Amino acid sequence: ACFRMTPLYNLPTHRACNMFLESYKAAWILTEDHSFEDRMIDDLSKAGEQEEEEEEVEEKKPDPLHQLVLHFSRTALTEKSKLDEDYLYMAYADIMAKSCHLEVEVSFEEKEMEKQRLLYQQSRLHTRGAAEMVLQMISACKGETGAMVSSTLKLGISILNGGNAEVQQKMLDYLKDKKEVGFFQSIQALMQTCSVLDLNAFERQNKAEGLGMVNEDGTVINRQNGEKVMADDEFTQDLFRFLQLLCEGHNNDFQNYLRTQTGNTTTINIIICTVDYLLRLQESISDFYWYYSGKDVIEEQGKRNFSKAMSVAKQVFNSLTEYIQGPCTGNQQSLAHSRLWDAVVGFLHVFAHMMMKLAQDSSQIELLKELLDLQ
Amino acid sequence: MDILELSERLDLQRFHSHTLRLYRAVCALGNNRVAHALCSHVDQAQLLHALEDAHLPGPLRAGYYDLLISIHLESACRSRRSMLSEYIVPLTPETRAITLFPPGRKGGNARRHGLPGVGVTTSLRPPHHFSPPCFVAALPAAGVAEAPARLSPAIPLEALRDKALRMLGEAVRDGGQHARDPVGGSVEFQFVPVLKLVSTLLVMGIFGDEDVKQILKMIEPEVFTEELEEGLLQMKLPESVKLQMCNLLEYFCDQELQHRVESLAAFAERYVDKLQANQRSRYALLMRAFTMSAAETARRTREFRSPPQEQINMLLHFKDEADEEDCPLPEDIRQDLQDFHQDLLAHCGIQLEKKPQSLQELVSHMVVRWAQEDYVQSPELVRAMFSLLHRQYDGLGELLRALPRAYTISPSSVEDTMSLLECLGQIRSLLIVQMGPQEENLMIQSIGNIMNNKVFYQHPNLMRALGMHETVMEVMVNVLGGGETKEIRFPKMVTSCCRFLCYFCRISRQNQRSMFDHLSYLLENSGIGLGMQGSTPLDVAAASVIDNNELALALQEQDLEKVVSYLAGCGLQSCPMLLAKGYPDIGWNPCGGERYLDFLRFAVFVNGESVEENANVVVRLLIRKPECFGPALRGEGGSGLLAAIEEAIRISEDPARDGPGVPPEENRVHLGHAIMSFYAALIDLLGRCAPEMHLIQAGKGEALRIRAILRSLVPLDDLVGIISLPLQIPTLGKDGALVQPKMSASFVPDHKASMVLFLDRVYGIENQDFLLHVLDVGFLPDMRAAASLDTATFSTTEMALALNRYLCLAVLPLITKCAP
Amino acid sequence: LVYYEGGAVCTHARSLWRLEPLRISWSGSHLRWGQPLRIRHVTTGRYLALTEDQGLVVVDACKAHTKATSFCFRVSKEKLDTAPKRDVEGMGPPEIKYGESLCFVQHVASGLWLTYAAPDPKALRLGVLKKKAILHQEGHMDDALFLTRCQQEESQAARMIHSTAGLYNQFIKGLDSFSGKPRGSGPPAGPALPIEAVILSLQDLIGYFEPPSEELQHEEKQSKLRSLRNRQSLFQEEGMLSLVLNCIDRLNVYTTAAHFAEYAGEEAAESWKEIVNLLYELLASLIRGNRANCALFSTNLDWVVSKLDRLEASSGILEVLYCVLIESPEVLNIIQENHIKSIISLLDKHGRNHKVLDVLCSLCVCNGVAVRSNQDLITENLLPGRE
Amino acid sequence: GVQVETISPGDGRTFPKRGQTCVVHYTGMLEDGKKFDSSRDRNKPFKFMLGKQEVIRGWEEGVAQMSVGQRAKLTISPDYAYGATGHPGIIPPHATLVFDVELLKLE
């Protein structure tokens, strides 16, 4: 078929134009960089020349940015069976998230300046109810994965980066006064839907990539449709990153609250739930090692799936570390009596055998480096 | 009494206002037949008089404005609004002249923005259709649900648009005067009814270029000048009026987006011609390269040995200035794209003063000013203004998300595309109405017209962009959703939609993949699809994975588990529909189970080979629920496969046990034939789940285990016994009439064909003595029977044709393999 | 009979139990392992019991004699049998936790363990996930039970259902006492109807199911709406909605108060009109805004429509019809011509009421979907008359 | 079932024949006095051709008896109009229709 491929000048004009539009948007429109999140948030955070009266109006009606957060907080608190998909919320959640981070020997002076600049950008949101909105949206999804919850988690991480104590206090206060069980029920459900390494899915992909499929209108060179092995790995990382940031800075009050919610009618132990996912991830990694144990060299697709599994395992270990540091005696006792020891025993078996296997060929040195820091 | 007396008679005012609400309700959502009836009660003169009546009470003024829209404009506006999200741009000379900026001398990178909604737009939009309201025409002789669908009542649009412009202009001046008696009793009642009418007419495209300019002057006389008159944006209106102002600005923002898409399509037509002309010239000179070059000619001709999509990807790869070596375009051609890329970003306000000077700056300033002037209390207004604000800040992203719905077509295919859009508009109108006998006929003929259109097959990508398969699927499931267990009504509509989707999948793999994304959605609605016969949602699911290894390997286990759970249910309960028809109660549903069996047949067998990933899962799922094998193969207390078939034959020969015993019903179900068909389907499925020979020869442990399980389920002697069963042969007698079996109520060669497939794939013929044993009891009697039927009378009989298919697909190919 | 059931029953009122220790003073102290106590079903008022005939059942309070109805929670099935613990005069030490402690329920008198009946096969095809609870000498390893707290809103509602059901059943059987027995020139010859109790109970429930005021902020309004929907579902699942219908039906067989006086006397007839109006008002409150409750009328719609011409509660019955139509699209699909003609006849006989027009508007479009049959029937039977 | 009562005389010489377009202005009321249709309100004359059964059969004979410029009152029995089926939402079943028709011109 290569030697009989039709040249572009023999195609009809309308067909060639359609191909041009697809090529132009991918190479020229998508690649274009336009940063407007900082400018948009700055414009919405300004009160408009209403300071010529300075009376008892000190109630200080919300600024345009504040009204935007209240509107999304309004639809999150609406009594509905399912949180319907909203592109407007997703678009603005990304805008708010992208406006808060904005980020080889950095000195002490500017290191603090970056932290203070980071705090100010986060302050523009959590002082306008953004911290409460994130919790409401998580509780509204009721444990259903999707673009809505993923956008909410990214926004929550954006305002919690660096261990923002002020945001943590606002989130903790809101949960304790409402005494709602939906937030942790949603979190627990999301963690149970997180995927691990599936060998059956991996085996199917290897056969699929060996067929070499093409399309009708032209010919696609091994189309790269969505990965089906740990497809939501990025979602899993931010879900545990969000939980880690709730305890960042050794917030003992939030560390105890994750283990037990005293005011709620029912209690969910998030600390134990994290260990449950770690066991499932560890078992999947152990199964993956046995699959390649007979084989002499791990091929490229296997190494990539190993790398993303280790990245998720790093976040879970970091999240567990943040739960107990400070130290939090209650969380330490909870982990001691949990199945964490079984997971650690399993990881040691995988670590010992993978180190010996990976060291036998220099083509897998990068994977070995990632394995070592995971240990 | 004068209707103006209702300003003090509040009891009658409320009742009459709700009467107008009832008028809108009965004609709501495309009920054009009732809309014509309402014209006999509220005629055109009354409606036009009510619009200009300044003494009408607010509820009545708002009611009559909404009544006019509902009767005459609601159907046309809704249909037009659905088409506004797509951009089908024909490559006509009018399209070629479209440019991002008007011809001017302001700046090379970007001139001044033109007035939004003013200019030439070539995107295809089907025209509005109206019928004159007449009550003296002869009533059609056509019966109900068969006459053509009624159109909306006709009202003079040119006169209506002039009145709407004049009334809006007067309101702006009147609003400036700050009169203590605004029309309708409040500022809200004076502007909202008028703005709704203007917004509706703008969407319908009634206003011309001059009319749009007048509207822009009223909105903002300073920004929208081309080269007390206060604009609406500065009149300090309440929140209800502000919501209508957002709708107006939303239309003009859409026109700017549409202009960018058409301009981009216009540039594509011009740029492709230069690309094609240059590539033709480059190829011409490249044919003489051997005189001054060598083996690296393959690198230069690499472009011509690549798919056309990849060819144009390489040609446009000169943006980052680090890829100016692989791109073979001359610098002059490269400059044209870069010049257009600069003025496209400028037209989106990327980069390149209290006056906004543009729609983008006007809307952004207005939304921010509104929010910081007061705490907005209307959630609808808050969403409207922030949705509008987001578009202005992200114009390139808005264009990026609209390109997937943009499509360029040849000017010679415009008329067929317009016809297809008309049919699609009819189908989309059925998403907001409960299905009925009249809507069923409209849905069926719309599907038939679409499938009769060449564009539907020439441009599968365009059909996918229009969401045609989604719209048809949503209509089907709404009918299936109602009455999901007791009775399915409008069966002809369901089988028309299902047949449409099956042909939709076979057009291209991309269409097949698109329907594969709804595989779980189809399966959950396929539980009751067994009741309907013909094309069913289960058939659509099967058609979305047939002969496609990529989709077969992507089939999730949950979908297979869902089907096996359905199959398990059919093996434990009788069909409720059959029981209600007087059928004898056997403790299972062979008819329903067979339909699920053939779906699994397509999931595990693709292109003549068994998909081991799906085959292993299906076998393991089946054995975990042994009731999927039927009352036979039950283990304890269960007769063998051979005994079940023999029992089914006796059932078929005996009435009062094979049917109701009251085709008679034109699709009469025979339990004897149904039982054989189930086991034949089950044996066929298990045979196709057998591992391929190369896996068995390789000694794979999983393959050997699966074959051992299959052998345990179906003993070899039962296979030979079924093949050895006699077949009824069309004979002659009783004056010479042909005594033929009824193929729908008897043992047929197709049942034997499934057994042969299992024997070949699972057991095989490895020794000569076994081969001879199979021939003289199972194969040779059938071969002789077919040979004897090759006479003048019996050659064309149904049984003879079935025997030929059985021999030429199962028996003879097997004997050819066993020839040595 | 007692079953182990899952699904929606975990949020219903029939899965609520009250633990009653065998004492009055300090009966609210912390529960202790091995402490005898009765287990009472809140909505029915019956006590878990062991009978020589049926085994493990729930019996009335007149048959709970501290021997069949004494149970205790034990941390393990080991036969400790150490000593009878003596109760203290105080809260005592906290032993059993909510949702963490695993408790084995043992019958004190017999020593049997609470477990499931190991359901017989061939019954799984029937969809019966329920496992019958039995008392057995050995039991199984998974007999441990988790004790989960119940919200005060649900606990109060379950007790109200118990009291409401008993009162209306007494009222219903009182009506059936003189169903076809005219009193003549004498007393109704039976116990007096609980007229004052029924009226007060109806008024309390009407105020109990009142929708939240529109002037509240969005946050608390949604919270009250969520609580209101939960309470409506709790009452409906216990048959309160069907109980109200039975009261209406028995009171609806009398055309007027004077006709009702011919069977219940004058003193009971003077409240006949008040009770029927309250019954329809309560019926509307039980279904207003609840699609699940409104969908129940998709099988009995002539029940509401045939009562539209009743003069004693014309406004209340119309409100009930309005609530059903605006919530349940299923009811709109069963609307027939005779139903619409009856509603149109309401305009002819009761005058120009705008609420009847709103009822007709709701028949056409529901949740953005139009019904052609309803629109055509309304147009055919209302417009051409021009009256 | 059409009775034609004259309101204002026409020319009295030219009459519409088969295949000729008739331009009329009409106002239709039910025989009890309730108006249901009128071309005057739409301000556009109604055009139809005789013999093509475009209109009800009552109009076929009624207009044929009229002259150009004549204004007449046509009373049509239910059989010569919509009759038992009627016009749903406009004309009740078994309704006698009364029309005030003016024959503007022929084309």
Could C125 and B573 be called an inter-chain contact, meaning their C-beta atoms sit closer than 8 Å? yes
Interface check for C369 against chain B (CB to CB < 8 A): the answer is yes
Query: How many Cα neighbours within 13 Å face the side chain of C290?
Result: 29
- The whole-angstrom distance between residue A308's C-alpha and the CA centroid of its chain comes to 13
What are the backbone dihedrals phi and psi of residue D35, each rounded to the nearest 5 degrees, phi first? -75, 140
Closest approach of chain C CAs to the CA of A59, in angstroms?
A: 17
Q: What is the resolution of this structure in A?
A: 2.5
A308 contact partners, CB below 8 Å, separation of at least 6: A230, A233
Interface check for B139 against chain D (CB to CB < 8 A): the answer is yes
Closest approach of chain A CAs to the CA of C241, in angstroms?
A: 23
Tokens of B12: 């009658």
Q: In this complex, how many residue pairs, one in chain A and one in chain B, have their CB atoms less than 8 Å apart?
A: 188
How far is the C-alpha of B199 from the C-alpha of B215, rounded, in Å?
10
Please give the DSSP secondary-structure letter assigned to residue C184: -
Q: In this complex, how many residue pairs, one in chain B and one in chain D, have their CB atoms less than 8 Å apart?
A: 51
Q: Which amino acid is at A297?
A: V
How far is the C-alpha of B170 from the C-alpha of B166, rounded, in Å?
6
Tokens of B271: 């740029």
Note whether A247 and A255 are within 8 A (CB): yes
Note whether C328 and C291 are within 8 A (CB): yes
* Positive or negative: CA dihedral B579, B582, B585, B591: negative
Please give the DSSP secondary-structure letter assigned to residue C297: G
Which technique? cryo-EM
Domains and CATH numbers, chain D: 1-107 (3.10.50.40)
Could B138 and D56 be called an inter-chain contact, meaning their C-beta atoms sit closer than 8 Å? yes
CA separation (Å) from B485 to B1, B406, B480, B538, C356?
55, 41, 9, 16, 34
Query: Quick count: other Cβ atoms within 10 Å of Cβ B650?
Result: 11
Q: Which of B487, B496, B581 is closest to B531 using CA atoms?
A: B487
Closest approach of chain C CAs to the CA of B734, in angstroms?
A: 51
C357 contact partners, CB below 8 Å, separation of at least 6: B15, B18, B19, B21, B22, C347
Could D82 and B139 be called an inter-chain contact, meaning their C-beta atoms sit closer than 8 Å? yes
Closest approach of chain B CAs to the CA of D18, in angstroms?
A: 17
Closest approach of chain C CAs to the CA of A351, in angstroms?
A: 35
Q: Which of B589, B772, B768, B571 is closest to B669 using CA atoms?
A: B589
Which candidate in B136, B144, B150 is best for mutational testing of the D interface (most D CBs within 10 A)? B136
Enumerate chain D positions whose Cβ falls within 8 A of a Cβ in C: 34, 86, 88-92
Tokens of C2: 């007692």
> Is A248 one of the annotated binding-site residues?
yes
Note whether C161 and C234 are within 8 A (CB): yes
How far is the C-alpha of B431 from the C-alpha of B470, rounded, in Å?
11
Interface check for C376 against chain B (CB to CB < 8 A): the answer is yes
B656: buried, middle or exposed (CB in 10 Å: 19+, 13-18, 0-12)? exposed
Buried b (16+ CB within 10 A) or exposed e, B291-330: eeeeeeeeeeeebbebbbbbbbbbbbbbbeeeeeeeeebe
Interface check for B731 against chain A (CB to CB < 8 A): the answer is no
B393: buried, middle or exposed (CB in 10 Å: 19+, 13-18, 0-12)? buried
What are the backbone dihedrals phi and psi of residue A163, each rounded to the nearest 5 degrees, phi first? 70, 60
Could D88 and C380 be called an inter-chain contact, meaning their C-beta atoms sit closer than 8 Å? yes
Interface check for B379 against chain A (CB to CB < 8 A): the answer is yes
> Is A32 one of the annotated binding-site residues?
no
* Positive or negative: CA dihedral B759, B765, B770, B771: positive
Beta partners for residue D35, in sequence order = D29
Could C222 and A267 be called an inter-chain contact, meaning their C-beta atoms sit closer than 8 Å? no
How far is the C-alpha of B784 from the C-alpha of B316, rounded, in Å?
69
How far is the C-alpha of A159 from the C-alpha of A99, rounded, in Å?
10
C355: buried, middle or exposed (CB in 10 Å: 19+, 13-18, 0-12)? middle
Buried b (16+ CB within 10 A) or exposed e, B93-105: eebeebbbbeeee
Listing DSSP states for C331-365 in one string gives: HHHT--HHHHHHHHHHHHHH---HHHHHHHHHHHE
How far is the C-alpha of B116 from the C-alpha of A360, rounded, in Å?
67
B668 contact partners, CB below 8 Å, separation of at least 6: B659, B744, B745
Closest partner CB to D85 (pick from B46, B137, B139): B139
Query: Quick count: other Cβ atoms within 10 Å of Cβ B749?
Result: 23
Helix ranges, B459-508 (H): 460-465, 468-481, 491-507
**B403 chain-A contacts, CB cut-off 8 A:** 21, 25, 29
Query: Quick count: other Cβ atoms within 10 Å of Cβ A189?
Result: 16
Neighbours of chain A (3+ CB pairs under 8 A): B, C
How far is the C-alpha of C276 from the C-alpha of C283, rounded, in Å?
10
**B412 chain-A contacts, CB cut-off 8 A:** none
How far is the C-alpha of A82 from the C-alpha of A79, rounded, in Å?
9
Interface check for B375 against chain A (CB to CB < 8 A): the answer is yes
3-state DSSP call for residue C282?
helix
Cα torsion A254, A258, A262, A264 to 10°: value is: 120
Please give the DSSP secondary-structure letter assigned to residue B572: T
Please give the DSSP secondary-structure letter assigned to residue C104: E
How far is the C-alpha of B314 from the C-alpha of B325, rounded, in Å?
11
Could D46 and B45 be called an inter-chain contact, meaning their C-beta atoms sit closer than 8 Å? no
**A266 chain-C contacts, CB cut-off 8 A:** 99, 148-149
Catalytic residues of D, by residue number, are 26, 36-37, 56, 82, 99
Give the position of tokens 């809505």.
Answer: A148
Q: Which amino acid is at B138?
A: A
Give the position of tokens 């028709």.
Answer: D101
What are the backbone dihedrals phi and psi of residue A140, each rounded to the nearest 5 degrees, phi first? -75, -35
Q: In this complex, how many residue pairs, one in chain B and one in chain C, have their CB atoms less than 8 Å apart?
A: 71
3-state DSSP call for residue C38?
strand
Interface check for A266 against chain C (CB to CB < 8 A): the answer is yes
How far is the C-alpha of A168 from the C-alpha of B436, rounded, in Å?
56
Q: Which of C385, C314, C366 is closest to C343 using CA atoms?
A: C314
How far is the C-alpha of B524 from the C-alpha of B531, rounded, in Å?
15
Tokens of A232: 């939501």
Interface check for A79 against chain C (CB to CB < 8 A): the answer is yes
- The whole-angstrom distance between residue B200's C-alpha and the CA centroid of its chain comes to 27
Which chain B residue's Cα is nearest to D42? B44
Note whether B555 and B541 are within 8 A (CB): no
**C375 chain-B contacts, CB cut-off 8 A:** 25-28, 31, 34
Beta partners for residue B732, in sequence order = B738
D87 torsion bin: left (phi>0), alpha (psi -120 to 50), beta (else): beta
Which candidate in C11, C149, C220, C233 is best for mutational testing of the A interface (most A CBs within 10 A)? C149
